[PDB]
Amino acid sequence: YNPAKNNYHPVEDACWKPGQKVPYLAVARTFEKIEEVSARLRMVETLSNLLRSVVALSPPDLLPVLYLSLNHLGDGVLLKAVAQATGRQLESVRAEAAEKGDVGLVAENSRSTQRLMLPPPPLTASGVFSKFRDIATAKKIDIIKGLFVACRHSEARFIARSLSGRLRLGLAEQSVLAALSQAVSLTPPGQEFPPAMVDAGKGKTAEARKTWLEEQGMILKQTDLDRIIPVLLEHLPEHCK
Amino acid sequence: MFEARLVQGSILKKVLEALKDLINEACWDISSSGVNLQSMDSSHVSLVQLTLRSEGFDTYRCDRNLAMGVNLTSMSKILKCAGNEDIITLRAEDNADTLALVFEAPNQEKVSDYEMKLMDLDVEQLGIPEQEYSCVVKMPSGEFARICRDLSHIGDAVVISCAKDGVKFSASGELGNGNIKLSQTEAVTIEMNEPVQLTFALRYLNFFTKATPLSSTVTLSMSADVPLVVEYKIADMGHLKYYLAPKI
Amino acid sequence: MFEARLVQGSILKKVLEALKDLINEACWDISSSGVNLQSMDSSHVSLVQLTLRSEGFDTYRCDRNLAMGVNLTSMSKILKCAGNEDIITLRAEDNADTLALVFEAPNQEKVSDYEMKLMDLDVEQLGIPEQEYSCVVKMPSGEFARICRDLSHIGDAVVISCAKDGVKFSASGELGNGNIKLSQTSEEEAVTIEMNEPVQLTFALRYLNFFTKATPLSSTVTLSMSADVPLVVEYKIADMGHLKYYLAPKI
Amino acid sequence: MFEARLVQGSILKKVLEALKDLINEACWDISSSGVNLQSMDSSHVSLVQLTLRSEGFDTYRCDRNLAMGVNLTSMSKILKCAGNEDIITLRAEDNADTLALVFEAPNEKVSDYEMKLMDLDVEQLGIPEQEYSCVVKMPSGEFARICRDLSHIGDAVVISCAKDGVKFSASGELGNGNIKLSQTEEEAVTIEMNEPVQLTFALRYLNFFTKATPLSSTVTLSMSADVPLVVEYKIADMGHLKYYLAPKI
């Protein structure tokens, strides 16, 4: 699953079926693809492709995926839970945690090394986000062991960064608020399946599209997002005040 | 109404002491042939497979097929009351969620009883992969226990291999590296089809090897790209298997 | 002037090893009859009384009814250094506030001796009124220690029951429920009971687990109680005297 | 091409356990005549001497003088994996930074571990020998008992010698006491006298020196006026273990 392709399509390039819960693997794969491109506009276009696909299949799922993206709701507990869930020994893996990067690269490399048993159920974004609110000692290490064992390919790094509270994806809350503004602009809510709209800016000039997106972004920033999102999908400057 | 009676309280104690640290909650299957346990570990890396067949039991009764579970820690805590030669009685009800243990001394002057609580679960299961193995060794229990307890101070993984000369464990670590070789002969015996290399995590081998006092011998059998088995045969009543998934 | 000697020198190690965990200060009262020691717990829940007959000592002489008080944990630590087979001599002056202890090896090749700080203790005395009981129990000390440890894994209080056939130790708790029944055995492995009415009481299991620290003092414990009065556990040390721990019934 | 073989692995284990905490780093003086080790403790209070005579090794093969460096904690951790009756052999190549320790069963099981060295430029200081004025030789068990016993009263011991017997004395917050010994087969003390001495010592370091009692049935205490104590352990024909400690003023 990739959103980096030029002229990517929120309909035919989705990673899940309609009426299926949103998977975290596409979210993690996006976060690492963003980390590989330094362009803020190319990052914003990638997030707009994600959000546009999310509103096209699962309109209720937008609050969690945004809350994760903004990280809005200790390292020794993390390393203990990684050691307990990944085998080896807490003291031996603690040497591996030195000289290398963050705990996430030890975690993902360990989950790469053990060929493991059967594949567990893929973690859904709503399940992940619900688990994080409950996570905020024995209770903590038990639930964090359940996150780490479920990691399917590369999600472990972004799970660890989320627990460390230092996601540092290269964007901020206003950047994703603008990403949502062009997401809702290119694909409005309240569509009847199949959605006849996929790119509302088609036939606008480059300057017209830049001005239109900036004016839509200006309405978002002026308008708690937990009541902003349900009003945006249900309908804005009069509906909220 | 389910009932089981056993003179060897030592073996029931030894089995729970082999499991109490690896599995917290476990599902028992109880049938005319015997009791079964077939559980995963919390990290989902090791499969524990147990079988206690009824012909070795001193008395057995299973009118109704029952599939109860219990938490192993609180059962281990209750079981430390029994003396080494005590007669152990297990009984349960097919309608209620409780298990009664009654402990009888060898001489009849003292009797102990214990109501452990019970619950129902449907823990995910996966079937036994019956297959041939290219590799198999029979070697005494204490040697494998020594080997794991020794290599666990050097490294983190054991790289197992087999040759026309014998077997070789090897491990590497921050303080150094080492290997141990056994030559082909209370003895060691090998049936060998083609050499192979693997890798395993010592944490689970240390957890398994607490079963040592159940049998004087063990069988390691394995093949390329599949789980390895560690087998302990109980004296004329059943067997215990462990599985571990290979690293890569 | 006061002095005493004992050939079986391990029993003093034992009686202080049982008491170090229960109390921290006590009055060693001394008189022509022998040693007397009564006290109350650090939490006023248990009464201890200890006596030693002077005629059980191998050598004794008392000319004044002294009273003295000592830190108990300090005397348990001073006595811990002595060898289990050695000979103990205890000496004290009527005026000088200091204890003298000697530890004679059996072959006299090593002489150990130590002296310790007395302090003036204001601990009260509460002489127990004397009465009969509804029941008396004699049974092996190593078995009572076993059952009291075994119940301690279930839950925080025991209810102890008596019947004409025997005795019932019963406990509930989080893990479950259990009870243990004992009945008469047809000299040191034979239990015995005598009774005039059946009884049913409750006790704080922690305090019994503290009390059973003295299991190596005697092969036989004596368990006894009556309606609403304190539980008495008594130990007969080898011909010397007796040790008893009291606990009023929990409510 | 260094080769050494010893049929009593229990000696090598015991001596390495006697050093497991007292010393962090040490250098081995490998030469044609055997093995030697001098080192000082982690707080620079006490010197130790270890000597391993080449005659105590059932096959010995050395080529040139070699110093080597290994951390005693890790070498001890490896040695705690050998069987207490195995044949042990040490092997290394004069150029490489790796020590091979091979163990062999009394009958099929070959186990070998390679320990990585580290370079050091450490100084070695000896001590002059002199004719001690008061020496005691006494059973190792009685010495461990007395040093454990008196440490419960206080961190200070005083010792004095007399014509019949040496006396160990201590005092603390909670009381005071002393142990008398007298001249009296291995269970017998021997005392020789030249002039009366009275010195004080630190219990903690005597406890740390006393960890090697299973090496020898009996021990020798060497002391005199104004000089460091010597505690002496002699191994069965192999060599000796010796410890040094100066008095408090």
Residue numbers in the entry:
A (entry chain A): 266 to 338, 350 to 412, 420 to 506, 512 to 523, 528 to 533
B (entry chain G): 1 to 185, 193 to 255
C (entry chain E): 1 to 186, 191 to 255
D (entry chain F): 1 to 107, 109 to 185, 191 to 255
Give the original sentences from the paper that presented this experimental model.
The second class (Class 2), termed “open conformer”, yielded an interpretable map at 4.2 Å resolution. The open conformer shows that nicked DNA can associate to the Lig1-PCNA complex in a partially bent conformation. In addition, the open conformer shows that nicked DNA can associate to the Lig1−PCNA complex in a partially bent conformation, with the nick ends set apart. A rotation of the DBD relative to PCNA would then straighten the DNA and poise it to be encircled by the OBD in the last step of nick sealing.
During lagging strand synthesis, DNA Ligase 1 (Lig1) cooperates with the sliding clamp PCNA to seal the nicks between Okazaki fragments generated by Pol δ and Flap endonuclease 1 (FEN1).
